[PDB]
């Protein structure tokens, strides 16, 4: 029970140990104690003269072989890892961009499922949609976006300019952190982190901010916009979470990864090939999602969430996973060893991600339907070899109400006020019924008790009338904890509980809205950004003035560093539950946590205790409230 | 003595030690012993769950926290670092591309100084040279190149396809390693190295090969082409090397870095402002070059080479360096603390490379002349403040003949055979007078006795009648040792000495050709590639079959890893004199040293001893000679 607060973990972990299967919790214990030079950021291997390390306490070397000090080594490493997290989101968004162009060229595998989103995004990009066919609007949209990936001049990329408020554009301009072309910025910054380059810690951090902007607008914002257009804007849905949503009677297919280009097709063809599953001796095809692609088909298709990042291995330990299909990012390579001990088939689909011991099924837009059919047909084959003596499906599962895109939030608020939908939300923030709103994002990290920080932070926040929106694996944690159940409004403060109830009864939902609003996947952090921009514009202020905060309680991936930097660049104080590899430098840590506030509005807040973090986040919100004369 | 074979280092080191200035040799001593996990490549920090380390002897954990094994950790790290080195050369070649585009738009800072190179490259790119103007050709050339940085399709790079033999194009197509877009391949590969991505070591190395092809054709080849066009193809020159080229009576300005867009303008405006130095009480303005940018002004302006990478700090220790101007790459940040102890002014010029303590003069195309005029004037100001009591200029220097571009080599060969200029070189290879030709490239590395590996490897090679071409800091080492002196032919084998004499007097040089051919900077390693391609086509054969080999005796930068991967991609066995962070995994090391030969023809060869490496590189050529039956 010391591993996690998720109730299903101990039994599934003990079941894995009895079978001699290595889990993420065992490999961490085997690494402790971890290297102190790497944890603090005082180790450098950016050239083959290294490794070089720096003694923070003044006895060993105070510079690398090239002469890099702690302020250089730490800041240079932060820029390279933020650049890498940005490259992940950009390459993700770029993948969806290819399908949008393939829709413009007339493909039958995908289509424009949300023309309302198309007209709205096209209007944001400056496209005049009058007298234009849908195919001409998609054609012109792809041309504008590709020009960002081809821009060779000093012009800021269009997808940033069209989606950012004016005050942010002026602040980023006077700091010189505006990105011009996402691919070019990734190449320039990666060049800037090679040996014998930038030795200015401020100039490096100023470039780290620019790649956070690349990540937020060429990665998060672009992906969410195009994914809503192609697959539909999420609207409120009811379903369940945690590994109890697996069914022994059904064929169990788990989708894992990030890009819904694969998981939407698996959901489509799981429904159409369900007769073949019954002919094999099963009630149907049960679908569950792990990580962000699980959040995608949760927000659009109501597919229940299996589990988050740290417990992806234990999903197969249930013995009921017949197939797990996978694309990119956050896929533990250990799943091949774990699926080898079972009938479970692990399937990889992307050319840049292969796992020895996993069947590779090439998935392209041309072959999306036939590759999807083969994958679930492999799962129907795999269901019949299942060993019932090795299945253990936990009883724990929680009710979740998700699908809260900005479009869905406005529609729910329009029941109270049709002309000014944000006004009921803003008036209650002003009155004090809602102290502030906090975005809890990020992954799981074995250094933190699994889901423990996510849940403990949010419970302390909603108790103080602090609305919580969430994405990614932080959303999985709050989902399995029952905090997206409408019944959880009892755990929120009376001011917040009244507002949640008022919105719920005005939508004829019977009960109140849950205290935690699920706003989608990691890329759907752009929705959160779009929301606080809309709130700030309503109040005639900047997001740096809003009584808000962001938090990554258990982050692990380089994508979280980029997102955190993006939120900092957006003017939002960003809390970090895990110690970043930067604390070895006094200057860099002071810049990222104090100097950044006067520079750009936001700052990082490092706090490993959930209760200390919650108290600090609430004090930051009250400070913003006091400056707003509330 | 123990530190270096460069004769000027010990006295300059003791002079720095006397003054209390820590050098690169000092900081390397303070790091010993270095972490065994990083040295072997068995340490990962690609996520904030780390650092994860694996025992090289295989005792403790053998998988990372995410489950990544030693094969995944080393190969994933190798791809990220090769991708990092590819972004350095691509960003270099991209800066020269912007200048070429400005010439098409009518700038007065630069122009086409070698119209014949321009017309030869235009023909290679498919441009019909005749009956169109120079501005037309430049504009047509720029659009073809920017298309490569904008290609969203599966079509290979135009710059790779136009400069590759058909066998390499066919071999790379089967391996799926053809690059499409240099900027996109960096983003996609950097994405492929984040956590939870590719777990296939072979698939990761196949992408490393692709990023080597990005580095060679979108970085090395593109830079060398457009720099010859803008500044002139190098032709044979006579000059000097080593730190004896600093003169106490002159204003000594050292250019340091890699991009000749700055050093060419400094050379231009150091001559035009010569009178202001004489008015300041000086004999004139003496220019010397450190690292690759010194090689650039060496090949085109005859500027002497001051020193290479490891001894860049000791140049300021001579007390005569009045100003050191710097752009990008391989710049030790310790230079600011060392210049702070002198009148020397360190000057940074590029926005991605600033160094606290060094003055910053922003260098752009439209302000190239103005910024250059300002910079040498700063040196004239600093000269008048030079302390003569702390000046110690070594007397050692060497006679250097360089400028051996592919164009310069063939016309020196055209004197011996005007109709078929390459015939004398080919016939002496098939006869045995030249056993083969070997390229020595790369930087310095404090892990190796300074220049000891470079010189020792070349002495035995030319002794065995192996012609040697070199670039980068390997060229600096051989230049200071007098191996580019015509007298050094005496050290070459008796069979190889004859062809050197038959080329010198045939060009009315009198002195025999040096056994070492300086072919330029590290981007000028494409010249070596252009020569190998020409030689292989003359023999109707693939470069993997030529009696050739490459060597990085003392590499350190990630740019050398990229170039080494490009050489291996060119079918050339690449020797490595420094242990790469890869040996911790036997499977990955065996793929790079053995399995790669069957796939692509080339392979890496790790050998820390110069005599065993020489014997091994020599033992590799006769085997290739036997396969040709010579
Ligand atoms: S860049 Fe400097 S600190 Fe980093 S590994 Fe190389 S020598 Fe060491
Ligand atoms: S972080 Fe650095 S010092 Fe620590 S194990 Fe890794 S290579 Fe060694
Ligand atoms: S990627 Fe895997 S091996 Fe690397 S630090 Fe993260 S958990 Fe460890």
Q: What is the DSSP string of A598-623?
A: HHHS--EEE-S-HHHHHHHHHHHHHH
What is the whole-number distance in angstroms between the Cα of residue B442 and the centre of ligand 2? Answer: 25
Strand partners, A151: none
Residue A188, token pair as written in the block: 């320039």
Do residues B476 and B398 lie in contact, with contact meaning Cβ atoms separated by under 8 Å? no
Strand partners, A450: A4
Q: What is the resolution of this structure in A?
A: 2.5
Cβ-nearest to A50 among B38, B184, B334: B38
Residue B579, token pair as written in the block: 């242990």
CA distance B609 to chain A (A): 17
After which residue numbers is chain A interrupted with C–N beyond 2.5 angstroms? none
| Ordered strands of the B359-360 beta sheet | B359-360, B345-348, B321-326, B251-256, B285-290, B305-307, B237-241, B398-402
| Ramachandran sector of residue A452 (left: φ over 0; alpha: ψ -120 to 50; beta: rest) | alpha
CA distance B292 to A227: 47
- Residue A217 DSSP symbol: I
For helices B166-175 and B201-215, angle between their N-to-C axes, nearest 10 degrees: 150
Distances (CA, A) of A177 to A161, A589, B156: 13, 20, 32
Q: Which of A544, A491, A479 is nearest to A517 (CA)?
A: A479
CA distance B459 to B443: 18
Q: What is the dihedral of CA A189, A191, A192, A197, to 10 degrees?
A: 180
What is the whole-number distance in angstroms between the Cα of residue A43 and the centre of ligand 2? Answer: 6
CA distance A348 to A328: 9
Residue A284, token pair as written in the block: 């149907």
Q: Which of A478, A495, A530 is nearest to A425 (CA)?
A: A495
Cβ neighbourhood burial of A14 (10 Å; 0-12, 13-18, 19+): exposed
CA distance A162 to A180: 13
Scanning A157-186 for CB atoms below 8 A from B yields 181-184, 186
Do residues A205 and A77 lie in contact, with contact meaning Cβ atoms separated by under 8 Å? no
What is the whole-number distance in angstroms between the Cα of residue A526 and the centre of ligand 2? Answer: 35
Do residues B442 and B291 lie in contact, with contact meaning Cβ atoms separated by under 8 Å? no
Output the residue whose Cα is nearest ligand 3's atom 6.
B47
Residue A406, token pair as written in the block: 């900005």
Cβ pair B191:A49 closer than 8 A: no
Cβ-nearest to A352 among B67, B69, B192: B192
- Residue B47 DSSP symbol: B
Do residues A492 and A483 lie in contact, with contact meaning Cβ atoms separated by under 8 Å? no
Q: Which of A65, A354, A552 to mutate to test the interface with B (most CBs of B within 10 A)?
A: A65
DSSP code string of A38-84? HHHT-EE-SSTT--EE--TTSSS-SS-TT---HHHHHHHHHHHHHHH
Contacts of B371 (CB under 8 A, 6+ apart): B265, B349, B361, B362, B363, B364
Do residues A212 and A566 lie in contact, with contact meaning Cβ atoms separated by under 8 Å? yes
Query: Which chain B residues touch A50 with a CB distance below 8 Å?
Result: 34, 38
Distances (CA, A) of A222 to A141, A218, A225, A565: 11, 5, 5, 17
Residue B35, token pair as written in the block: 């972490």
Angle at B217 between CA B451 and CA B259, to 5 degrees: 55
CA distance A63 to A7: 47
SS3 at position A510: coil
Run of H or E residues at A294: helix A291-301
Do residues A553 and A559 lie in contact, with contact meaning Cβ atoms separated by under 8 Å? no
Per-state percent for chain A, helix, strand, coil, to nearest 5: 50, 10, 40
Technique behind this structure?
Answer: X-ray
Which ligand 3 atom sits nearest the alpha carbon of residue B65?
A: 7
The upper half-sphere exposure of residue B489, i.e. CA atoms within 13 Å in the direction of its Cβ, equals 20
- Which stretches of B194-290 are assigned E, i.e. beta strand? 237-241, 251-256, 285-290
Distances (CA, A) of B315 to B12, B290, B310: 8, 9, 10
Helices vs strands, H then E, count in chain A: 27, 16
Do residues B113 and B230 lie in contact, with contact meaning Cβ atoms separated by under 8 Å? yes
Strand partners, B69: B63
CA distance B448 to B389: 33
CA distance B178 to chain A (A): 14
- For residue A365, whether the previous peptide bond is cis, meaning omega lies within 30 degrees of 0, is no
What is the whole-number distance in angstroms between the Cα of residue A183 and the centre of ligand 1? Answer: 26
Cβ pair A356:B200 closer than 8 A: yes
Q: Which of A220, A285, A228, A264 is nearest to A86 (CA)?
A: A220
What is the whole-number distance in angstroms between the Cα of residue B44 and the centre of ligand 2? Answer: 8
Helices vs strands, H then E, count in chain B: 27, 16
- Residue B4 DSSP symbol: B
Q: Which of B361, B356, B354 is nearest to B340 (CA)?
A: B356
Residue A94, token pair as written in the block: 């770029």
Distances (CA, A) of B119 to A555, B125, B128, B384: 55, 10, 9, 47
- Which stretches of B327-389 are assigned E, i.e. beta strand? 345-348, 359-360
Contacts of B117 (CB under 8 A, 6+ apart): B225, B228, B229, B232, B233, B407
CA distance B1 to B343: 29
What residue ranges line ligand 2, CB within 6 angstroms? A 35, 37-38, 43, 45, 51, 53; B 35, 37-38, 43, 51, 53
CA distance B231 to B227: 6
CA distance B434 to B489: 13
Scanning B432-461 for CB atoms below 8 A from A yields 445-447
| A258 annotated as a binding-site residue | yes
Residue B81, token pair as written in the block: 């670092």
Distances (CA, A) of B102 to A56, A153, B140, B230, B361: 48, 12, 13, 11, 21
Cβ-nearest to A199 among B35, B355, B446: B355
Cβ neighbourhood burial of B147 (10 Å; 0-12, 13-18, 19+): middle
The upper half-sphere exposure of residue B24, i.e. CA atoms within 13 Å in the direction of its Cβ, equals 29
Distances (CA, A) of A250 to A241, A242, A580, A585: 17, 17, 43, 54
CA distance A553 to A441: 7
Q: What is the dihedral of CA B21, B25, B26, B30, to 10 degrees?
A: 160
| Ramachandran sector of residue B391 (left: φ over 0; alpha: ψ -120 to 50; beta: rest) | beta
Backbone torsions φ then ψ of A159, nearest 5 degrees: -65, -15
Q: Which ligand is nearest to the CA of A34?
A: 2
Indicate the top mutation candidate among A47, A51, A192 to test ligand 1's pocket, ranked by most ligand atoms within 8 A of CB.
A47
Neighbours of B217 (CB within 10 A): 29
Indicate the top mutation candidate among A51, A62, A63, A64 to test ligand 1's pocket, ranked by most ligand atoms within 8 A of CB.
A64
Domains and CATH numbers, chain A: 59-234 (1.20.1270.30), 235-403 (3.40.50.2030), 406-630 (3.40.50.2030)
Give alpha helix (H) positions in A440-484.
452-463, 472-480
CA distance A74 to A44: 9
Residue A616, token pair as written in the block: 């600090």
Do residues A145 and A223 lie in contact, with contact meaning Cβ atoms separated by under 8 Å? no
Distances (CA, A) of A381 to A249, A274, A283, B12, B484: 15, 13, 15, 74, 70
Query: Which chain B residues touch A69 with a CB distance below 8 Å?
Result: 333
Cβ neighbourhood burial of B152 (10 Å; 0-12, 13-18, 19+): middle
CA distance A304 to A290: 9
Residue showing tokens 């310790």: B334
Instruction: Name the residue of chain A whose CA is nearest to B44's CA.
Output: A38
- How do strand A251-256 and strand A345-348 relate by DSSP bridges? unpaired
Q: Which ligand is nearest to the CA of B47?
A: 3
Do residues B606 and B580 lie in contact, with contact meaning Cβ atoms separated by under 8 Å? yes
Q: With an 8 Å Cβ cutoff, is B195 touching chain A?
A: yes
Do residues B311 and B4 lie in contact, with contact meaning Cβ atoms separated by under 8 Å? yes
CA distance B92 to B98: 10
Query: Which chain B residues touch A206 with a CB distance below 8 Å?
Result: none
CA distance B310 to B604: 24
- How do strand B466-470 and strand B516-518 relate by DSSP bridges? parallel
Do residues B206 and B176 lie in contact, with contact meaning Cβ atoms separated by under 8 Å? yes
- Residue A216 DSSP symbol: I
SS3 at position A470: strand
What is the whole-number distance in angstroms between the Cα of residue B584 and the centre of ligand 2? Answer: 14
For helices A201-215 and A166-175, angle between their N-to-C axes, nearest 10 degrees: 150
CA distance B348 to chain A (A): 10
Cβ pair B190:A84 closer than 8 A: yes
Do residues A309 and A473 lie in contact, with contact meaning Cβ atoms separated by under 8 Å? yes
DSSP code string of B496-562? HHHHHHHHHGGGT--SPPPSEEE--SSTTHHHHHHHHHHHHHHTTS-GGGSSEEEEETT--SHHHHH
CA distance A79 to A87: 12
CA distance B80 to chain A (A): 9
CA distance B537 to A158: 47
Output the residue whose Cα is nearest ligand 3's atom 3.
B64
Residue B88, token pair as written in the block: 């350095």
Neighbours of B95 (CB within 10 A): 18
Run of H or E residues at B87: helix B70-104
Q: Which of B43, B46, B65, B523 to mutate to test the interface with A (most CBs of A within 10 A)?
A: B65
Query: Which chain B residues touch A33 with a CB distance below 8 Å?
Result: none
Backbone torsions φ then ψ of B551, nearest 5 degrees: -155, 135
Residue B248, token pair as written in the block: 């106490």
Residue A196 CA to its chain's centroid (Å): 34
Cβ pair A22:B67 closer than 8 A: yes
- For residue B33, whether the previous peptide bond is cis, meaning omega lies within 30 degrees of 0, is yes
Neighbours of A592 (CB within 10 A): 28
Cα-Cα-Cα-Cα dihedral sign, residues B192, B193, B198, B200: positive
- For residue A51, whether the previous peptide bond is cis, meaning omega lies within 30 degrees of 0, is yes
CA distance B568 to B550: 9
CA distance B466 to B548: 9
Residue A108, token pair as written in the block: 């039958």
Residue A295, token pair as written in the block: 């959040």
Residue B149, token pair as written in the block: 């940085």
DSSP code string of A376-424? HHHHHHHHTT--GGG----S--EEEEE---HHHHHHHHHTT-SSSTHHH
Cβ neighbourhood burial of A265 (10 Å; 0-12, 13-18, 19+): buried
């Amino acid at each position: 029970s010391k591993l996690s607060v998720d109730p299903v973990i101990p039994n599934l972990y003990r079941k894995a140990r009895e079978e001699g299967i290595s889990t993420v919790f065992d490999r961490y214990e085997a690494q402790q104690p971890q290297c102190g030079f790497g944890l603090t950021g005082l180790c450098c291997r950016h050239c083959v003269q290294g490794p070089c390390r720096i003694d923070p306490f003044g006895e060993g070397p105070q510079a690398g072989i090239c002469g890099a000090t702690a302020e250089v080594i730490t800041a240079r490493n932060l820029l390279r890892q933020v650049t890498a997290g940005a490259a992940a989101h950009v390459d993700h968004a770029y993948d969806v961009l290819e399908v949008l162009e393939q829709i413009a060229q007339g493909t039958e595998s995908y289509s424009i499922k949300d023309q309302e989103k198309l007209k709205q995004v096209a209007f944001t990009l400056g496209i005049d949609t009058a007298n234009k066919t849908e195919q001409e609007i998609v054609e012109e949209m792809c041309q504008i976006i590709y020009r960002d990936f081809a821009n060779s001049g000093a012009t800021p990329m269009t997808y940033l300019k069209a989606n950012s408020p004016r005050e942010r554009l002026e602040t980023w301009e006077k700091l010189g952190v505006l990105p011009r072309n996402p691919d070019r910025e990734i190449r320039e910054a990666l060049h800037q982190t090679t040996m014998g380059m930038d030795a200015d810690p401020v100039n490096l951090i100023l470039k780290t901010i620019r790649l956070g902007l690349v990540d937020g607008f060429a990665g998060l914002k672009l992906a969410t916009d195009l994914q809503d257009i192609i697959f539909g804007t999420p609207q409120p849905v009811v379903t369940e979470a945690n590994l109890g949503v697996l069914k022994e009677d059904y064929v169990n297919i788990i989708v894992h990864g990030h890009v819904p280009l694969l998981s939407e097709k698996i959901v489509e063809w799981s429904r159409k090939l369900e007769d073949e599953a019954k002919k094999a001796g099963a009630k149907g095809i049960n679908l569950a999602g792990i990580c962000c692609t699980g959040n995608e088909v949760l927000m659009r298709q109501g597919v229940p969430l299996a589990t988050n990042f740290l417990a992806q291995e234990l999903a197969i330990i249930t013995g009921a996973v017949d197939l797990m299909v996978v694309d990119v990012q956050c896929i533990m390579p250990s799943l091949a060893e774990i699926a080898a001990c079972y009938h479970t088939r692990l399937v990889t689909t992307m050319p840049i991600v292969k796992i020895p011991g996993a069947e590779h099924v090439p998935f392209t837009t041309e072959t999306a339907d036939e590759a999807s059919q083969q994958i679930v047909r492999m799962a129907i084959e795999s269901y019949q070899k299942r060993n019932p003596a090795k299945v253990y499906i936990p009883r724990e599962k929680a009710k979740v109400v998700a699908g809260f895109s900005v479009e869905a939030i406005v529609k729910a608020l329009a029941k109270l006020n049709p002309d000014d939908p944000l006004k009921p939300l803003i008036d209650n923030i002003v009155s004090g019924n809602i102290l502030g709103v906090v975005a809890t994002v990020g992954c799981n990290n074995v250094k933190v008790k699994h889901d423990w920080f996510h849940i403990e932070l949010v419970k302390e926040l909603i108790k103080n009338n602090v609305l919580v929106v969430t994405t990614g694996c932080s959303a999985h944690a709050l989902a399995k904890a029952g905090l997206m159940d409408p019944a959880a409004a009892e755990w929120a403060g009376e001011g917040l509980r009244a507002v949640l109830t008022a919105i719920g009864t005005a939508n004829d939902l019977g009960g109140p809205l849950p205290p935690v609003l699920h706003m989608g996947s990691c890329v759907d952090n752009s929705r959160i950004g779009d929301l606080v921009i809309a709130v700030a514009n309503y109040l005639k202020v900047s997001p740096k003035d809003l009584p808000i905060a962001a938090s990554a309680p258990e982050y692990q991936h380089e994508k979280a560093l980029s997102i955190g930097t993006w939120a900092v660049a957006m003017g939002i104080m960003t809390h970090l539950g895990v110690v970043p590899p930067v604390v070895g430098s006094s200057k860099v840590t002071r810049i990222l946590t104090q100097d950044a506030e006067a520079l750009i509005g936001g700052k990082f807040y490092v706090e490993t205790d959930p209760y200390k973090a919650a108290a600090g986040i609430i004090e930051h919100i009250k400070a913003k409230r006091a400056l707003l004369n509330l």
